[PDB]
Design a protein around this ligand. Structure first.
Ligand code: ZN
Ligand code: ZN
Ligand code: ZN
Ligand code: ZN
Ligand code: ZN
Ligand code: ZN
Ligand code: ZN
Ligand code: ZN
Lengths: 401, 401, 401, 401
């Protein structure tokens, strides 16, 4: 309330600090949206974002590390520059995504994800910078995570230990409605290659193998759990009709709400692929993807605290697929709310690219960044909340084996 | 020629003896045709045929053994009753078939097969009975072989040793044209049963197994040798749609021109059946038929001698499927000529039953019986022919491993 | 409260009247459970239930009509016998089901459905019988509806106009948990018959038609809405392998949450069935079931009033498939709550038959009957509720076209 | 015999003229074999062959027309230069093929086909050049026909009228054995394209269409005539698994021994392709090849005359697929004998390329060219043969509708 240094007053400061930075935050979104770049090729977005945190006044007050582990990834850190000597500081992480989609551009609104992560972290710092009483030990960490749509850049960062010292991690994703949580499933990719032998009696038909595998999985759909998903293509199904195909290649991905269910679904698919080899006489290589994507672990305490802030900002509550943030949420407590940006268009369509770059989307983006920053302030000043986040994180970890 | 006791004169005697017996031979065909009986159920035909050889004058001059090994099989033997004491007699076999088809009756003309086997043997005896100079040691053996269309009664007789002491075996089969030999293939029967487990996620779908097996074999047809044949049905594909089928059953038969090719074809089918089990998660029982049918081994010497007789009778030369005579032809040299009976109807159709019982078919049946009997006389009096039959039989046996 | 003739006091009377009748209501359930009868064959259950309402004291105070429209259906009615002359009486319906399942008996607990419908109606009458002040014009109607698991006896009753004068209809169904509503989908049954022509070149393969139809639907599953369901069997897939099958027969049922979605799903299946005919060369008969089952329309006012009563009885809130009550709920406002009976066994399994007939299930059955009866009392004495039920019923009817 | 100007003496002259030209004919084969060129790209072979006939002494005695209708086709003509004025001259055609195979080179021995056509025509001219008595009116015509393995260059030449004035046409093809005729079937090519629409419920799956078409044809194989052939590939079966494929493409070719059978086979395939569209909901384009290849019409008189010559040369008598010579044989009487070249390797394999260019193949090639040339001499001097060829050609034309 009207009290010296209230949490409600710090929350107001962070919202004022975000409104003051609206112009240059909009420029940041425009720079990434206008130059769409694909996974691991986000060189321009990496330059724009590293320069953004280097130029925040005072110069070099954000400690920026470009090319952090990945060439297009980065890391920016800020803390109050004073020590006292008590005693573990709180580490709060904010993620920026910035990879686009082939052909249609930023049809997932990833330019706004970079903006919202930068804005939230800016707002937190400004609320803590305007504090007389020595501020609690906090480090604001920003991580640029490339290649969300393909590869999974967060996973490469996890393998470098980038998340081992974070206590909470925040990010947000533009969608069609406002929701503090939405079920993103685990995912496993696979590439299947069949090899036979090229009169047609003396023939092993690798095209038959591909078709029989397709038939095997198709009838299996009747026994799939209703939450499971299986999609795939025949990449190579022959070259010339006068030669019996001695090579075929399929590309599939499977999805399930948990890792244990995903392993069961993957094993039944493996049987379907191996059966086609047995029936055709071909040999088969089944090569899984480099990284499995994890389902997103929810955190009741963090989500309930986030919704209470958004309701004050005026957000009314009620996705794209699977994200490498699920791997993050398995090692650091986090939230990944989806927000609406003034459009009815669907994600990963051409009309969403229009909305993602529109002037009208800027209001909704900064508003949700305000909600993230206030939620970070809650964790900083409510120790009962921090233990609540850690309790919910520990319990959900056991239920996922 | 016009020489005392010429082979040409004995051949004429056998034709006269067959013409004299035309009336009662026609009655024999009529008795079997008018009362069609199925495999192993030919009780009436067994009575008619045993009574036929018992009534041939003088009474009991044919040594008849009813219920020989099988209830509806029989054996009849005749030899010149005088001994001399020299020295191995020649054993000449003639087979009678007499089983019909379900519903359509004697649509394969099996009544005429019984007639032609009885007639040939009658003609041989009459040619040798009217001989003054002590006749060469010969035993005429007639074997009633039931269950040709299903089961294979000749094979049951082979297992009892019925063919171990025969030197040559004769029979003939009514068809659409006249041919001393026609390619009957080997055959292997199989019954495939799938077992699963009965919400549908917790389900093993045995109907999927049947359909996937069908798909597996269907695409395999492109790589089958053009002489191979595969036919099958889904006998049991479920009972009620609201229960996931936990049981399915297929019935298939495979055909190939040789036993070595048939084993290769059977092994690829086995892979197709097992792949469906792997893809569906079901277990599978693959039960082969009680008896595999063999392809018919030709005998150049016997066939060339048969065609030379038929040409004298006026027969001009150029099938149903697979016959257990192929198993016989692997242990005794034999011939299985097909003959035309005055009709364009196809075997195993309703209109062939009409032809098989017609008066017009009697002329062609007795004519081909005349050709068989003269061919038997050739073997009896041409030792160079007998060794030629045995040489060709020995060589063909090696080529079939 | 402690007021002369309170609704809370009438609700207590109905619970006392149900407890007093527990012994003979248990006997009623035992009589149906011990003699399981199938659809349209429930002659013994029809006798037991008609005799039950005829014996309720005073004799013939329930007006019983046996063999109502169907041979095993019945109708029982009671009202206060006094007229006043004001003015439309309220008609309250209670349904009794009593058909079992082949082999496993009453694995859906339908004996308890008959009991709960009889008990609810008994409790309502006893609450209104013990009233001095002239009671509001009410008619309690009980309808025996045979053949729920097959055929749909309620639909036959709808076609006779049995529901045209009911204002509200009640029934309850034993399951695994307590829920005032659970989503039962619409359903459409179909029987598909393929006709071809019986050498195999001159052949139309009706078995191919069945298998191709199966393949057509199987790959379609990937594009089915996740709430849709398709299940089917190959009833007839051939008779003998040596005859090319000229006839095949499939039996399928489809489910969708609305009639509009069900028509779309049925049309795509029709394309899959017709494509198999085109590909094989066969003709096809597609024969839909005699009666389509409708999805169950919820009624917010009735369900919220029912849950408020159950909470007082001690019921804690949170199915089998599709029911012909959905057709009823489209013409009369109704509720179809599911209740737990002391077991973890699943419906339509052998172990549920054990629970359905157990002594332990009697407490839960009478308890839910108490909840239904009190809910009926709410409708009788709260005119604001009756209009609320009619408003919600009218609006839901428009959303379903 | 030893008679002035005997046909046997002219036949000897043609064999001597071919032996004298062995060195430069071998060089011709070597020039084409060492520089393999594909269909319609045979620029170097066109230069070599046109220069060959231009250099035959006396210069320009062969009237050479380069770039005849096609850029790599050619035409060379020779006749005795003297007129007499009687009266229609005999036109005798010899074809040269010279296109190779992708990757493996001249694995069909087409370099030897060019050689044998040049050699036969050289031998005919030399036999007629060494004649005093005015020679009968004959024109020797050589036609370079490119693109046999793809496209069908003879068909392009037929459409230009190149064959309308030929009386007999000769060519020969290296294989594994010596045969005056071998059954080459008719062929029809087709390209099938499926178009759908890209959540997956709102999806038309063009990949399903391709797979269902494959299933439709696969089960049809059981009812195909045993002489029919169907082969095909899935050229395009998707691009990325996360997008439902809205486009697929198949490439198939069908073969049958006659055009009437080929139309029936093509119509059943058309049904299979259209059924997949109906089942999937996609639209379909079925585009047949630019040119259908015809089966080769035999000519008993020409073949019997050819075998009588080859037997004198020492050839003992007893393929690759389908050839555009079948279209030629439908408008001009011709023969297309296959000859052995000293190898057991199969056509269109890497080891056949070795044999085709070997020194050992030259003897067999020149020998068969001798047989062709003597057969041409038979037609020139036996008018009874010419009418016999024309009678057999006319009758076979009616049997093919
Ligand atoms: Zn995305
Ligand atoms: Zn995204
Ligand atoms: Zn038969
Ligand atoms: Zn037969
Ligand atoms: Zn039920
Ligand atoms: Zn039920
Ligand atoms: Zn070739
Ligand atoms: Zn070629």
């Amino acid at each position: 309330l009207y009290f010296q240094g209230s949490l409600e007053l710090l929350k107001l400061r962070s919202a004022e600090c975000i409104d003051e930075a609206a112009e240059r935050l909009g420029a940041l979104s425009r720079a990434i949206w206008s130059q769409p770049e694909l996974a691991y090729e986000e060189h321009h977005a990496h330059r724009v974002l590293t320069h953004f945190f280097e130029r925040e006044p005072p110069a070099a007050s954000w400690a920026v590390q470009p090319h952090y582990q990945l060439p297009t990834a980065f890391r920016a850190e800020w803390e109050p520059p004073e020590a006292r000597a008590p005693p573990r500081p709180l580490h709060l992480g904010f993620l920026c995504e910035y990879d686009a989609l082939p052909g249609i551009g930023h049809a997932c609104g990833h330019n706004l994800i970079a903006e919202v992560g930068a804005a939230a972290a800016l707002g937190v710092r400004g609320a803590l910078e305007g504090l007389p009483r020595p501020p609690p030990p906090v480090k604001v960490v920003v991580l640029g995570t490339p290649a969300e749509e393909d590869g999974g850049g967060k996973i490469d960062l996890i393998e470098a230990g980038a998340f081992t010292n974070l206590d909470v991690v925040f990010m947000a994703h533009p969608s069609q409605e406002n929701a503090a949580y939405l079920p993103d499933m685990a995912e496993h990719d696979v590439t299947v290659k069949y090899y036979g032998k090229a009169y047609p009696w003396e023939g092993l038909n690798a095209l038959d193998a591909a078709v029989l595998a397709y038939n095997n999985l198709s009838v299996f759909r009747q026994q799939m759990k209703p939450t499971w998903r299986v999609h795939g293509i025949i990449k190579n199904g022959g070259v010339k009709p006068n030669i019996i195909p001695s090579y075929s290649e399929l590309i599939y991905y499977f999805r399930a709400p948990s890792m244990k269910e995903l392993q069961v679904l993957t094993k039944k698919a493996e049987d379907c692929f191996r059966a086609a080899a047995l029936a055709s006489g071909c040999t088969v290589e089944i090569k899984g993807g480099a990284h499995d994507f994890y389902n997103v672990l929810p955190n009741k305490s963090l989500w309930k605290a986030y919704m209470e802030n958004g309701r004050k900002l005026g957000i009314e509550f009620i996705p794209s697929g699977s994200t490498d943030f699920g791997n993050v949420s398995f090692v650091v407590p986090g939230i990944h709310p989806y927000f609406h940006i003034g459009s009815n268009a669907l994600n990963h369509t051409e009309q969403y690219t229009e909305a993602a770059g529109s002037q009208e989307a800027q209001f909704y983006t900064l508003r949700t960044a305000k909600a993230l920053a206030m939620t970070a302030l809650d964790v900083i000043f409510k120790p009962e909340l921090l233990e609540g986040i850690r309790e919910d994180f520990k319990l959900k970890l056991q239920e996922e084996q």
